[PDB]
Design a protein around this ligand. Structure first.
Ligand code: ZN
Length: 257
């Protein structure tokens, strides 16, 4: 099956998932000089005050912090979006070294990591139905650079030892994802896709311009995770990022002047 190893990585995905060579694939490089300010874009509305985290799972390609999305609690609205999108999970992509790890790039710059908060459009009733629609998901992307620690990330990093290997999960209640947001909600937006198989073209991307800072110790702990299952030969979970894809017939819009 697909992965990020030497023989099943992103350059191989198209064989099982032909949409990998599609017209609206993600991630992409954000060329800051070509992205146009769009005065018609509204402020993002991130309402996470009532977010209910439940569990954290190592799924063999990342770790997902999962939320209770059976009610309208943690929602993303406004910005380029029409309607309401419910938070279902967040996860990260990171590198083996600080000089790579992010999926989106900014003027070809790679960040050390990238956070994805995944939300589905409530007009489609459930996540499974939403991913079959061009406006089914809204993904909020946030870059991580290495510097000062992010206090709000530490509860995530400290639980990672308990989910080292594929298929392991742990209770993870009462985690507040507001602690992962940067100061500014300025963003770029474009239509794209899931960045892991099945690579469905169902995502409105909202990528924040301001990165958050995390410490070297924090990201080092990400890199102690395993792609493999318990008892199997150790493959460190690093470089679980898909590289930039062709922009094709798309425009990236900026929310800021
Ligand atoms: Zn992702």
């Amino acid at each position: 099956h697909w992965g990020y190893g030497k023989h099943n990585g992103p350059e191989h995905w198209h064989k099982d998932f032909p949409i990998a060579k599609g017209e609206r694939q993600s991630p992409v490089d954000i060329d800051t000089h070509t992205a146009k300010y769009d005065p018609s874009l509204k402020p993002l509305s991130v309402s996470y005050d009532q977010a209910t985290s439940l569990r954290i799972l190592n799924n063999g390609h990342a770790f997902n912090v999962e939320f209770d999305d059976s009610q309208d609690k943690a929602v993303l609205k406004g910005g380029p979006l029409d309607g309401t999108y419910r938070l279902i999970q967040f996860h990260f992509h990171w590198g083996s070294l600080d000089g790579q790890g992010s999926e989106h790039t900014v003027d070809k710059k790679k960040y050390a990591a990238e956070l994805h908060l995944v939300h589905w459009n409530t007009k489609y009733g459930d996540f499974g139905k939403a991913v079959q629609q061009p406006d089914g998901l809204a993904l909020l992307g946030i870059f991580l650079k290495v510097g000062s620690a992010k206090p709000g990330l530490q509860k995530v990093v400290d639980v990672l030892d308990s989910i080292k290997t594929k298929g392991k999960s742990a209770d993870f209640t009462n985690f507040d994802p507001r602690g992962l947001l940067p100061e500014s909600l300025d963003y770029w937006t474009y239509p794209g896709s899931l960045t892991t198989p099945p690579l469905l073209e169902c995502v409105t991307w909202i990528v924040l311009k301001e990165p958050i800072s995390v410490s070297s110790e924090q990201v080092l702990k990400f890199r102690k995770l395993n792609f493999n299952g318990e008892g199997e030969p150790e493959e460190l979970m690093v470089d679980n990022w898909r590289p930039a894809q062709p922009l094709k017939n798309r425009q990236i819009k900026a929310s800021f002047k």
